[PDB]
Amino acid sequence: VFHKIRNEDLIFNESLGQGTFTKIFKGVRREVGDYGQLHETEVLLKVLDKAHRNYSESFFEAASMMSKLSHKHLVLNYGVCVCGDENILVQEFVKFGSLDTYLKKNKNCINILWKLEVAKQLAAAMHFLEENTLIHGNVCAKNILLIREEDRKTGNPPFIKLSDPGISITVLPKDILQERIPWVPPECIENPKNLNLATDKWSFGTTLWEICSGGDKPLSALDSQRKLQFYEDRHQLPAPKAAELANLINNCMDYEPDHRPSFRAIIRDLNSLF
Ligand SMILES: Cc1ccsc1CN(C)Cc1nc(N)nc(Nc2ccccc2)n1
């Protein structure tokens, strides 16, 4: 179970946006750290919409299972606030935020080597999840967090973490699942209970497409009916202009879930480039 954090020890500051049935805020947590030192720690606060309080179990169950698996590429969740009528996840505040926003802002300065490093780190996280037979279920660029930027001055590569799963697509409304095409795989549109480890290989492909596309969203021009038909006609995403990962993207976005490659094989493929 998550550590319970008192409402009295949390300060809510600015809204940073929204997710699926969630509102996101920056805040501060007062805590006692190592050696009894008092800290005021910047935190990211995810608030489940009170109207959708029925999704709270799913909201926190996935985050909890993943937080039981500590890993350098998985986000740190400090705990939860049962802040009265609010269900709140208290998460580390990552300095540079979501990768899709970062990709759009810095597209002119991100090259293939940067993209390759990030892809390898994401694949490393996903391999760890695969070995632990833990399904994430919402891999996407918005859920990749940039801990530190590349610094060619000191040779340091960028460093990323994968964020929490969110509400499970096994419980989300059908219309939300359709809007999440092409991250949600065809078999889960067919039946959300088909959620499987193979799901994350497909979404990883879509995320690689995002990483290579300057933060564009694939198929954003298609409404939900046209996204459904895209899967019905078994289309694949267009190659990114920077097409170095196009083959890997299409190999991961395989309409046959059993044919999607293991993350170990994906990592071997990534290492074989450049
Ligand atoms: C912020 C947000 C908006 C919709 S969803 C979501 C949460 N998450 C996907 C992104 C994130 N997570 C964490 N842990 N930290 C940050 N930092 C940050 C935020 C904003 C600006 C600069 C840096 N951003």
Numbering used by the authors: 536 to 809
Sentences from the paper on this structure:
Previous studies have demonstrated that JAK2 JH2 binds ATP and possesses regulatory autophosphorylation activity on Ser523 and Tyr570. To gain insights on the compound binding modes to JAK2 JH2 and to analyze whether any differences could be observed between binding to WT and V617F, we determined the crystal structures of selected small molecules with JAK2 JH2 WT and V617F.
Diaminotriazine compounds 23–33 were found to bind JAK2 JH2 domain generally with selectivity over JH1, except for analog 33, which bound JH1 domain more effectively than JH2. In general, the binding of diaminotriazine analogs was stronger to JH2 domain of JAK1 compared to JH2 domain of JAK2. Data in the present study and that by Jorgensen group indicate that aminoanilinyltriazine compounds might possess slightly (2- to 3-fold) stronger binding to V617F than wild-type. All compounds anchor to the hinge region and extend towards the Gln626 gatekeeper and towards the G-loop. Overall, the binding modes are highly similar between WT and V617F structures and no major differences can be seen that would explain the differences in the observed IC50 values.
